[PDB]
Amino acid sequence: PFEIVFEGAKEFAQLIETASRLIDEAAFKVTEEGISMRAMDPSRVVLIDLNLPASIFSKYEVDGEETIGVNMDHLKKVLKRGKAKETLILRKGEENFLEISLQGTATRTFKLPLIDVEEIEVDLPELPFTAKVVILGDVIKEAVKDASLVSDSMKFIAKENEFTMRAEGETQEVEVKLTLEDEGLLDIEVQEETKSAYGISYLSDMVKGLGKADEVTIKFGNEMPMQMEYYIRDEGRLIFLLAPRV
């Protein structure tokens, strides 16, 4: 019987599209604290975590807690219908239906039946991250684009006050390097020299849709999984956990 309201339905639609670009079935946990989602891709390579606190939503009235599951394709198609200055209201009655209402000049209401999706509680604890890098969306997006242009895998090398991304192909070579003085690197900190390689397809899926004026926090180590995160409304958090090759 909960009711949840949001402002700027386009932002929520883009968030859902980014989250669903890698998974097919998702289960959202609704509580008093907020809405949470944690899932893994079919290849068991990338872990996706979504956290939306109650302070973001304009209205948030939940009495209890229950888990709801819905198909990502239908939800994405419905949410893509929203505009940039509309009000999104998600409602769930005593029936097992999810009502999606867009409030603009006229109110449009959609219905989506709930589907029973298996719940597998897996979590990744904190790991020792040797290097922490704060970067903008544009530099990483075009870097991944060039790496896909030349090669199939991307290598991240972080040293003291420097950050480079290399793409080694069969014939061609691409090197992109930037320092703290450049506007691409807002922050940087390195405990020790690190080097790792990751795939491009997963990176291309994750970085697509990122804005130009967006701050992305990238943490990674030596031959151990990379963690990418960025914040929405200064409290909402999306976490990507990508395993390295080999």
Partner 1 sequence: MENVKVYGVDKLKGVMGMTSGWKMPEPLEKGLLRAKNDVYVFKDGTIRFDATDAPITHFRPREIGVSVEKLRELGYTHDFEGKPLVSEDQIVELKPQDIILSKEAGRYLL
Using the minimum distance from each CB to partner 1, give the nearer residue, 51 or 71. Answer: 71
Residue 32 sits in the site that holds partner 1 (CB under 8 A):
no
Of 116, 121, 123, 181, the one binding partner 1 (CB under 8 A) is 116
Residue 181 sits in the site that holds partner 1 (CB under 8 A):
no
Residue 17 sits in the site that holds partner 1 (CB under 8 A):
no
Query: For residues 52 and 236, what is the distance between their CA atoms, to the nearest angstrom?
Result: 5
Residue 98 sits in the site that holds partner 1 (CB under 8 A):
no
Residue 25 sits in the site that holds partner 1 (CB under 8 A):
yes
CB 244 within 8 A of CB 223: yes
Residue 117 sits in the site that holds partner 1 (CB under 8 A):
yes
194-199: strand order across its sheet: 173-179, 162-168, 153-159, 194-199
Q: Which stretch binds partner 1 (CB under 8 A): 58-66, 116-124, 201-209, 233-241?
A: 116-124
Residue 24 sits in the site that holds partner 1 (CB under 8 A):
yes
Number of residues lying near partner 1 (CB under 8 A): 11
For 161, half-sphere exposure in the C-beta direction (CA atoms, 13 angstrom radius) is: 2
Kindly identify the residues of this chain, within the stretch 47-76, that bind partner 1 according to CB under 8 A.
Answer: 71-73
What does the DSSP 8-state code read for residue 245?
Answer: P
Query: For residues 157 and 19, what is the distance between their CA atoms, to the nearest angstrom?
Result: 27
Residue 118 sits in the site that holds partner 1 (CB under 8 A):
yes
* Least Å from the CB of residue 246 to partner 1: 16
Query: For residues 45 and 53, what is the distance between their CA atoms, to the nearest angstrom?
Result: 27
Q: Which residues contact 191 (CB under 8 A, 6 or more apart)?
A: 130, 131
Would you tell me which residues interact with partner 1 (CB under 8 A)? 23-25, 42, 71-73, 115-118
